[PDB]
Design a protein around this ligand. Structure first.
Ligand SMILES: [Zn+2]
Ligand SMILES: [Zn+2]
Lengths: 24, 268, 708, 202, 116
């Protein structure tokens, strides 16, 4: 595996925000 | 002392000689509620001490209402022999001292005649008039000893560290799991104490076993297999071979799963 | 933290549930078998072996960390307990009380309960007593610091888990649509008990514009919010005047009494202690209590479940009611806006669970499971008449696999990421990972910001740039975490140096009395708090009280808080005293003390060994946490802010603060930084995000992580 | 030292009159002075009873009155179980203090129920002042705080729920006065005086 | 408001309309204790509150090292050394007026000029 401190942004990863805000 | 209250039958006259009422004429006794540090408390509250001996002398100076306690030299030399009695409350109200003692059991408007009252011989033996706290005097030659003791209270630790086994780890683990040694402990040897009991029974003749069964049915009408077996010492097969002939098992009554005598022999 | 855990907490966990009693009733159809048996298995002293490994073929030999790393073994050591087996028999006569006696089958006897993984360079590890040449013989790096576990050959570091402190009253303003305006909650916990968390919430219903603003508290195992007046009467304080005396400590606080009036309006039609207890027992959620036992049910809830951090025993209803009134008082000050809601980001209200508390709660759970398995096997054997074997009674694989699994995978149970693979990229990366801390994150707080109370305790610029920004913190260089001491000697010292008990405390005849809290437990009041604080600080500076103990005097609020629990992050500070010889404030440490320190250092590189413990013992330095940091004034450097007052234009502009009342001095301000930020040259000449970026990227450098 | 003051010897109690006798501390919780010699209707009965269902248990005057009237009238099992271990001192403490102390006068005018107070029951020492001015020392073992009950006709739990219920509106400010004027749920003392006057008028 | 309690049972007293004298009687809801009202005011409600701004003033407030020291003149001692703090009432719309505690006579003198 890998363990890096260099924050490479996870592209195409909006479903975290979708599950964070699923209700309106 | 178990007892039931709300007794309108007046059984307390017969079951207690001592009066249940609160004894009160000692209530005018003057009592000082005195607080102590732990060394004086441990010396003065243990029951192996306190044989009526003198423990000190009280001096009251009326110039400023100062109270000093001077202990005797018989108990210890590390503790001070002069203390000041600080009056935390000069006037103490609604505070009394009562004793509790066992009794002599030998020789709207709706009410219930049952309270579950436990009566005890009680007696108000004093009235608290002065709340006092004991302070060691500053000028005593043992006040520094008291300071050292109170520092040792927070200095010492009451818990010891874990013990580390310095023996060889193989010698330590020789007791574990796979081991040659059999368990010599006898803790919960239920199988050992149960398998040693063996019931071996001979075949007595049919006339004898039927006579014995008829006598036991005359003794008591309903029987279970285990109880009648420990009464008769017979094999299950022969015991059933006689029991079906001269008895029947109950299947639906309140005494079900029990062998009882036949109704023909019941009248005999 | 690990040394404290192994030395004391293992024995504490064993001794809380040391005994286990099973009664076999007679079940007698005939009176010939009227005997009742009582089998007790009692645990005693616990022993820990040196780190060992058993091979396949049963050979057990001493295991060293290099061999464990090479062979993918767990660097663990065996735990043994003394087990003594009491057995009792009684004549089972109905009606007559059973009297048990020994049959003298009191067998006792160390038995194996599992393998505890050993953190390297701890008191159990082989590398603690090894010299540098011994480390070279064992092929261990002398620069290697330990601090980690070896689980299946992988170096595992236990990240410190940040949690909000227990036994503290925190008052919070709720949202506008909610009918409750303010909530005063305490997450009551006890350390020497069942370790269960009970949340007591005292809630003020109705908004500011409303009229019927009542106060109701959420008792444990009660399905409804009971009014506070009903709870006070159930605790035994009947009159309204006495209830308002327990809650409000000023006779002229008619704001507070006016807000408390709807509470006694709500609780007016209960006027008896048994009526209030019947009310609480009807609101009991167990739903298995008969009509006449609800009084005792509510009494048991109020004794064993209501505020357990105070006590579990009976006879302390007055103490619990005083604490409840203090909670309602704090709630009403926040409602009247005399104080704001308590800061969730205050670092003194936080605790850090190191390897001690984490393995402590894990071993507690695993030992409960072990004792449950012991009782289950013993019950099965006595029921089915099988032979009892203690090797089958104890499954050591329960403890062994539980500790091994929770240290191999970070799932702390049966919280994720508690244990991570130790970073071995560079030496500084290993140090930063070993001093790394973690904060779990869904509340209404803002925990990602660098708080004011983070000064000198965590690094101001060392944090990941991603989702872990602000949650993952790194300790400052001199910052330490307390391992926890017993508060009972300090409570006894207070009781014999003037803290009168709370049972005899009357607030109206003691208006100037200072409340005394020990680990969040209100134990009493003191008439003169200043000299008590003076003698307590003298004891801590002379070393009689443990220097990790934090003592705070809030003069404005008339409070004296003493914290002896674990998890508190503190830092050392110089002590500044009066120094009447020179007529001005000055540091207690002098050039003679510095020379003694340097002589000890150069002897290490014949005089007396003058150490950090010596500086702590005659009290030239002091351990200050974020809570004690609130009541002190600190100078940044000695030789400018201590003595009384042409400058170089190249030097930075510095203020002298125009105040000479200092109680402490910073040792050096560069020690507010962490391991990665202390590699940065001139970090005060840099923009702070660039210091954060270098703190991130210094772990990805190439160097020599270890010499082996 | 000059004898310009008064000076009193101090001594401990003998242990012969400490066995089978426990010397507790009584503390009435009241704003006014309480004196059981004067403020109480003799005889006073300090005993250990079940306090649940107050106002429905008879006072001693009604007890002796009913004694007089009836005297005139007549003339598969579970084999194994787990025991949660508990310490013996608190087990005995719970067993003793399961029923609280109750001190009642003859007419029910003063009824005081005592709660055990465990905070400082082990540090108290009583100095009894004897007739000759000496001091005798007693180790106080337990402390009880006595609260007066049924002094203002407390109402019951069921219609207490009915008043708590939001179906009913605001509780009236003088509901107790209305109930006392009607004659509902009166004091034990008032009921005792009613019973004694209904006996005495015959 | 000056809340007052019954002297028989220590419950608070409530207002009573009287008819035979047209007067205010403070009366206990439990045990029928009635007394005269010393003031006609029975309910007092502050919308702007000025109490609690000087809360926490204790006789050893000068023992706090965190409190700043000033040199402003005490108008009871003519002394220079003192401490000061802002308003302890922590509303969001309160003023920033300094309150000074003299360390010789424990006097509370303010920096306000609109009041003076
Ligand atoms: Zn009243
Ligand atoms: Zn002045």
């Amino acid at each position: 595996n890998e363990n890096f401190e260099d924050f490479d942004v996870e592209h195409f990863s909006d479903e975290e925000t979708y599950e964070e805000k699923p209700q309106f | 002392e178990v007892f039931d209250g709300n007794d309108i039958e007046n059984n307390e006259t017969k079951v207690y000689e001592e009066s249940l009422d609160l004894d009160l004429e000692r209530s005018n006794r003057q009592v000082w509620l005195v607080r102590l540090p732990m060394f004086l408390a441990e010396k003065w509250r243990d029951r192996n001490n306190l044989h009526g001996q003198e423990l000190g002398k009280i001096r009251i100076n009326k110039d400023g209402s100062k109270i000093t306690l001077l202990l005797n030299e018989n108990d210890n030399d590390s503790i001070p022999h002069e203390y000041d009695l600080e009056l935390t409350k000069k006037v103490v109200e609604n505070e009394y001292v009562f004793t509790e003692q066992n009794l002599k059991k030998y020789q709207r408007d709706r009410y219930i005649p049952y309270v579950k009252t436990i009566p005890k011989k009680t007696a108000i033996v004093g009235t608290v008039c002065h709340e006092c706290q004991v302070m060691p005097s500053m000028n005593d030659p043992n006040y520094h000893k008291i300071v050292e003791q109170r520092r040792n209270i927070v200095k010492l630790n009451n818990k010891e560290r874990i013990t580390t086994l310095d023996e060889t780890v193989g010698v330590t683990m020789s007791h574990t799991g796979m081991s040659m040694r059999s368990d010599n402990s006898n803790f919960l040897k239920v199988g050992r104490e149960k398998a040693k009991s063996n019931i071996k029974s001979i075949r007595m003749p049919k006339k004898e076993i039927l006579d014995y069964l008829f006598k036991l049915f005359d003794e008591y009408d309903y029987w279970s297999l285990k109880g009648l077996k420990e009464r008769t010492r017979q094999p299950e097969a022969h015991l059933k071979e006689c029991l079906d002939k001269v008895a029947t098992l109950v299947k639906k009554g309140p005494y079900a799963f029990k062998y009882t005598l036949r109704p023909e022999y019941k009248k005999l | 933290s690990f040394n404290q855990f192994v030395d004391y907490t293992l024995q504490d966990i064993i001794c809380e549930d040391s005994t286990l009693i099973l009664e076999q009733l007679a079940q007698h159809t005939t009176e010939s078998d009227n005997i009742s048996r009582k089998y007790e298995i009692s645990f005693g002293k616990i022993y820990v072996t040196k780190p060992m490994v058993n091979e396949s073929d049963g050979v057990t030999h001493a295991l060293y960390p290099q061999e464990a790393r090479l062979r993918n073994l767990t660097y663990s050591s065996g735990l043994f307990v003394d087990v003594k087996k009491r057995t009792y028999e009684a004549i089972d006569v109905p009606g007559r009380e059973l009297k048990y006696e020994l049959i003298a089958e009191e067998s006792e006897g160390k038995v194996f309960i599992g393998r505890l993984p050993i953190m390297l360079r701890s008191k159990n590890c082989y590398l603690s007593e090894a010299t540098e040449s011994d480390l070279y013989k064992l092929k261990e790096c002398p620069f290697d610091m330990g601090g980690y576990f070896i689980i299946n050959g992988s170096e595992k570091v236990l990240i410190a888990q940040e949690r909000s402190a227990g036994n503290i009253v925190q008052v919070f303003k709720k949202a506008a649509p909610s009918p409750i305006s303010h909530v005063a909650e305490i997450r009551s916990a006890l350390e020497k008990g069942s370790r269960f968390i009970s949340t007591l919430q005292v809630k003020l219903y109705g908004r500011e514009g409303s009229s019927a603003r009542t106060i109701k508290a959420t008792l444990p195992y009660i399905k409804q919010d009971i009014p506070i007046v009903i709870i006070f009467r159930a605790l035994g304080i009947i009159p309204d005047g006495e209830i308002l005396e327990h809650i409000c400590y000023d006779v002229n606080d008619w704001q507070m009494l006016e807000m408390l009036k709807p509470c006694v309006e709500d609780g007016f039609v209960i006027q008896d202690r048994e009526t209030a207890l019947d009310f609480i027992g009807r609101r009991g959620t167990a739903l298995g209590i008969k009509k006449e036992k609800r009084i005792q049910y509510a009494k048991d809830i109020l004794q064993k479940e209501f505020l357990p951090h105070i006590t579990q025993l009976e006879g302390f209803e007055s103490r619990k009611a005083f604490f409840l009134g203090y909670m309602i008082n704090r709630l009403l000050l926040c409602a009247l806006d005399r104080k704001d809601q308590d800061d969730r980001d205050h670092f003194g209200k936080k605790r850090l669970d190191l390897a001690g508390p984490l393995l402590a709660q894990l071993f507690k759970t695993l030992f409960k499971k072990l004792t449950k398995d012991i009782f289950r096997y013993m019950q099965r054997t006595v029921e089915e008449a099988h032979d009892f074997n203690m090797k089958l009674a104890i499954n050591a694989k329960t403890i062994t696999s539980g500790l091994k699994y929770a240290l191999a995978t970070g799932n702390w149970g049966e919280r994720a990421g508690v244990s991570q693979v130790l970073n071995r990229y560079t030496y500084s990366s290993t140090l930063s990972h070993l001093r790394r801390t973690n904060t779990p994150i869904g509340k209404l707080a803002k925990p990602r910001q660098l708080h004011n109370t983070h000064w000198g305790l965590v690094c101001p610029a060392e944090t990941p740039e991603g989702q872990a920004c602000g949650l993952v913190k790194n300790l400052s260089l001199m910052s330490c975490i307390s391992v926890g001491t017993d508060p009972m000697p300090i409570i006894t010292f207070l009781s014999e140096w003037g803290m009168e008990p709370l049972e005899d405390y009357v607030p109206h005849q003691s208006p100037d009395a200072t409340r005394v809290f020990v680990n969040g437990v209100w134990h009493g009041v003191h008439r003169n708090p200043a000299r008590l604080m003076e003698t307590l600080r003298t004891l801590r500076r002379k070393g009689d009280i443990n220097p990790e103990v934090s003592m705070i005097r809030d003069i404005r609020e008339k409070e004296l808080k003493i914290f002896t629990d674990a998890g508190r992050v503190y830092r050392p500070l110089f002590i500044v005293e009066d120094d009447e010889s020179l007529g001005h404030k000055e540091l207690k440490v002098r050039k003679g003390h510095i020379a003694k320190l340097m002589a000890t250092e150069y002897q290490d590189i014949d005089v007396e060994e003058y150490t950090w413990s010596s500086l702590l013992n005659e009290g030239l330095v002091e351990y200050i946490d974020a809570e004690e940091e609130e009541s002190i004034l600190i100078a940044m450097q000695p030789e400018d802010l201590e003595p009384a007052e042409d400058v170089d234009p190249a030097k930075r502009i510095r203020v002298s603060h125009h105040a000479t009342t200092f109680t402490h001095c910073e040792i050096h301000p560069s020690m507010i930084l962490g391991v990665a930020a202390s590699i940065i040259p001139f970090p005060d000449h840099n923009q702070s995000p660039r210091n954060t970026y270098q703190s991130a990227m210094g772990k990805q450098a190439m160097g020599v992580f270890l010499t082996n | 030292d000059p004898n310009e003051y008064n000076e009193f010897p101090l001594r401990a109690i003998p242990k012969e009159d400490l066995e089978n006798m426990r010397t507790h501390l009584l503390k009435f919780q009241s704003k006014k002075k309480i004196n059981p010699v004067t403020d109480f209707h003799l005889p006073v009965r300090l005993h250990r009873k079940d306090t649940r269902n107050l106002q429905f248990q008879l006072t001693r005057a009604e007890i002796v009155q009913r004694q007089k009237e009836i005297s005139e009238y007549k003339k598969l099992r579970r084999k194994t179980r787990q025991l949660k271990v508990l310490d013996e001192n608190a087990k005995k403490l719970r067993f003793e203090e399961f029923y609280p102390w109750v001190m009642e006068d003859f007419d029910g005018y003063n009824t005081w129920v005592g709660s055990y107070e465990a905070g400082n029951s082990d540090s108290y020492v009583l100095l009894s002042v004897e007739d000759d001015g000496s001091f005798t020392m007693i180790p106080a073992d337990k402390v009880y705080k006595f609260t007066a009950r049924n002094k203002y006709a407390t109402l019951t739990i069921d219609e207490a729920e009915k008043r708590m219920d939001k179906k009913s509106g605001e509780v009236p400010r003088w509901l107790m006065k209305h109930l006392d004027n009607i004659g509902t749920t009166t004091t034990r003392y008032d009921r005792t005086r009613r019973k004694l006057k209904a006996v005495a008028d015959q | 408001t000056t809340f007052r309690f019954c002297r028989d049972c220590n419950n608070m007293l409530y207002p009573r309309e009287d008819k035979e004298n047209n007067r205010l009687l403070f009366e206990c809801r439990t045990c029928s204790y009635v007394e005269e009202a010393g003031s006609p005011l029975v309910y007092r409600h502050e919308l702007i509150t000025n109490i609690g701004e000087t809360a926490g003033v204790v006789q050893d407030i000068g023992s706090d090292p965190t409190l700043p020291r000033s040199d402003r003149e005490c108008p009871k001692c003519h002394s220079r050394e003192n401490v000061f703090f802002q308003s302890q009432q922590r509303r969001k719309d309160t003023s920033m007026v300094l309150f000074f505690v003299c360390l010789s006579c424990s006097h509370i003198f303010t920096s306000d000029q609109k009041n003076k």
